[PDB]
Design a protein around this nucleic acid. Sequence first.
DNA 1: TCAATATCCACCTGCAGATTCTACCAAAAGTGTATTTGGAAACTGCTCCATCAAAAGGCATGTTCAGCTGAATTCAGCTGAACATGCCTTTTGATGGAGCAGTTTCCAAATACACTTTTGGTAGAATCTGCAGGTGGATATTGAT
DNA 2: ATCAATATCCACCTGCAGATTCTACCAAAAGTGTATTTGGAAACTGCTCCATCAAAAGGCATGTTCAGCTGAATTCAGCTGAACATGCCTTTTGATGGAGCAGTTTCCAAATACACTTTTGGTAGAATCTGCAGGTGGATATTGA
Lengths: 98, 99, 106, 104, 95, 92, 77, 84
Amino acid sequence: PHRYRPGTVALREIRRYQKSTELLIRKLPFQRLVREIAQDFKTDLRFQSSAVMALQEACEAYLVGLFEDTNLCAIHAKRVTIMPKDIQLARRIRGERA
Amino acid sequence: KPHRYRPGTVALREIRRYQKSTELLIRKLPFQRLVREIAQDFKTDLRFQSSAVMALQEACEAYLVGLFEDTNLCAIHAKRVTIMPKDIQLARRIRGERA
Amino acid sequence: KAKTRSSRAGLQFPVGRVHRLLRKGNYSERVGAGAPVYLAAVLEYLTAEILELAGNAARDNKKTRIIPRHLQLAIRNDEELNKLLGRVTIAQGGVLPNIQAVLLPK
Amino acid sequence: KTRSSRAGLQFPVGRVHRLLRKGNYSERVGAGAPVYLAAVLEYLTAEILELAGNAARDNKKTRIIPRHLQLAIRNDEELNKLLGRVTIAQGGVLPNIQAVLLPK
Amino acid sequence: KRSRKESYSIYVYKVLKQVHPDTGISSKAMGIMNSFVNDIFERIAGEASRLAHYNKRSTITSREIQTAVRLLLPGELAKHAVSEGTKAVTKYTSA
Amino acid sequence: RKESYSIYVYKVLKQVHPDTGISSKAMGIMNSFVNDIFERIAGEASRLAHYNKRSTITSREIQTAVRLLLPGELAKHAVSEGTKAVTKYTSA
Amino acid sequence: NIQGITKPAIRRLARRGGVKRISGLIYEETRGVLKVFLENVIRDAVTYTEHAKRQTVTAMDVVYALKRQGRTLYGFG
Amino acid sequence: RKVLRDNIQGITKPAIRRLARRGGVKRISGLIYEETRGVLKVFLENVIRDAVTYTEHAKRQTVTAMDVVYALKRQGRTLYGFGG
DNA sequence: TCAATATCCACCTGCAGATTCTACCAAAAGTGTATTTGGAAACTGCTCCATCAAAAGGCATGTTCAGCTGAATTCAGCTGAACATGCCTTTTGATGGAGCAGTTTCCAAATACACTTTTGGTAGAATCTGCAGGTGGATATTGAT
DNA sequence: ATCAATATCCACCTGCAGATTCTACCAAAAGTGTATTTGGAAACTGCTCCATCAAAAGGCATGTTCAGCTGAATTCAGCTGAACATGCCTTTTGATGGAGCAGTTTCCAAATACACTTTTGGTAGAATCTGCAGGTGGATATTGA
Ligand SMILES: [Cl-]
Ligand SMILES: [Cl-]
Ligand SMILES: [Cl-]
Ligand SMILES: [Mn+2]
Ligand SMILES: [Mn+2]
Ligand SMILES: [Mn+2]
Ligand SMILES: [Mn+2]
Ligand SMILES: [Mn+2]
Ligand SMILES: [Mn+2]
Ligand SMILES: [Mn+2]
């Protein structure tokens, strides 16, 4: 039998994704999410095929950054697991909230 | 004979004292030199408008008082009550200043 | 016999000024007739809205004269104004009394 | 006779002169302004394509793609500051794993 | 030989009386106010120029100013803003 | 017809890396870049003008703009590269 | 539909982010911030579609909005 | 007159301490004092540089309030109170 | 170290799939000429800034002490990563009929424009008064015993 | 659970520094009569965009295990707050000299207006080139005895 010790796939995972540049969220779900949000503002709306990519990109790209800032906040607290609180401080600092 | 406060009593005292005020905390003159000095080193023989200085001091202190909160938040985020350089680097790092 | 366009739209702000600054400031080739009006209003409104809270803050501190501090408190307690003026700093303004929770004695 | 070749550049001084009188930047635009700007533009484009180019080879490809442009930017400090609040589409981050997280 | 400088100072005062008849405002505070106006002015007008440009239209209608406000001001403040805005334009147009 | 700095960029590319090419998306990135810088430089240029009550944007403005916008060395090479381009244009 | 952004995804994200361990609580908290982000971007974007007198949201609309939010995006005109 | 030299040390400790109370800080690590000057100096430079640049582009030998302001503005650290 | 297991890096290899080069054309840049005009080169006017004096006590600095904070360890209840499984939205590959984004072609309304009145807005000396800076009795809170 | 010891609180108080009014100038809104052109308003044309339809597959979701992370609880060396004495500046207010900021005057070299010629710089088109993604051996790493 064989198994990689806890937190080793993650590393191989980090290196993996950091190496790529492909989107991670799933297209279809995301669109459904977009379009849905857009409703609260204007109905019967069509989105340029790429107008979603723009959103898709801007989005993944924003989160990843927020994560890096979150990871630093987790570490700074002597931890190694990002928690909701980190994600918050990260933002309370960016000026995004409070 | 004599009295004496436990450490923290005057800190919280001052924190209250200065958040209720809006006076500049740095001494004007020392700040002025620093300013002329720095300017001095970009273009010599510069003259400053009495206010140009005030603007800068007003802006500076605010930037820091602002920097110190985000700092104090980081000390507390690591279950500490004393801000440390570790904390200023983070604040600034996350802000995007010294990435 | 002429009348300021300000009154025509019944505003307290200089509707003529605004139109001029829209031109002397080159923002666009031309400028509608209501542009200065509309904007002038939005400006009068916002200025009116923060003067209302300032004067209150000024009334609480127990004085009859708005000063920078009051404008800080005003702008800093109203969620919406605070966001409008998030990356702004009021000279002589100060900060809102606020000791972090975990620092207080136990 | 193209004002551009005149000033010895690849970027459109002409066009640029056109975009200036459009943007509603100032009532009138000086003759050298377009030129000067175009150059400044061509320059940075050169600075970027170069570095990016190296990244393309450093990876072994011959077609410069976003990932190369991205590496080229964030790797260099100056550009990284210039384009600090910008995000390259199809860019990816730069390899980075905090020491603390590391094994053994 | 004089060089008189402008300011929205007289008007802030007119509005101050409207919301606080007895209340008065200091020089510095008046200064803070005056800045506020120009800032906001610059923002809205800017946001405007862009809409107009982004839209190949060469003029800033009071309609751009509005979309500017909607884009610039946060919710409630925007409602009210827009309100007072239309109320002044329509009234105006009726000589 | 829609325009872009697609061709010019390509010239500069084939001028420092004759051997290599450039992806469409990369071109779209590079393209988005020129424009941004353009706007940044032209804006700050515009304000430089206004602040000083001038109704014409000159090289002097652009330059300063460039001084204000671009960081460290990036600043200098640009300014140079720019002033250079100026004289050489005025000569012919 | 926000639950559509599956956990595994939010995690791959935190990977590119450089995160090793993840608190199960994150996943919702993250779905939270994300929606705010999109609510913000689209409202400002749609407004553009609107003022533009259209029924179709273009990339530009998204782009201009991103710039507004200080999230400049290169690569889509 | 006299030569302006290492004046950052003017921004004493009592002060940095103060700026930190109004900031809400109750306990200050001793190494903080030197860090603050570290940043105060960087901040002050960046703002002042842009200012003077503005001063130069206006062929003036004096730094004016507006300069300092168009400066802070540029830096995204917009100030009100001298703004005019 | 010694392996058994699993991931990973690396020559090596044959195509649409984007890429890149062409072959032609409106839109746009060049140029010729002519008509304004922004604002740079001198000159004073005369604020606003530099400096200097001087006397005072507001503050800074440095030292002694020790309260209590940070930081180092120890411990085990579990949270969340690794892994194996099972079932299902996602990806995709056209296809269709058309909602709409755009292109023209005019044109009535909306602006720019140039001059001449007709006033608000300013700047500058009146003429006030908030409230700053003390002055002192009550709370209110702290910390010793 | 009391009781000094300090600091925080307010209400008065009173002069003057900072408003708040009170009058004389124009830079600048306001009219009116044109001259220009802007951006809807029909109206037509092809995109591009939903909207099905139908399969294979990654992908996702669950549930099982337990490695080792996060948290709470002590503990002790030292750091950083408090308090105090010392006496070094920073303030304060005014005075004087004068750089140089900032209103005028002018000319010029430079920029803007028309409109009449060439070149581009985009568009599909046509002819290529690459990085794709599949292999599959050959190490690298992990991990366990
Ligand atoms: Cl949490
Ligand atoms: Cl209008
Ligand atoms: Cl020029
Ligand atoms: Mn020096
Ligand atoms: Mn502790
Ligand atoms: Mn009058
Ligand atoms: Mn008092
Ligand atoms: Mn002189
Ligand atoms: Mn050609
Ligand atoms: Mn491959």
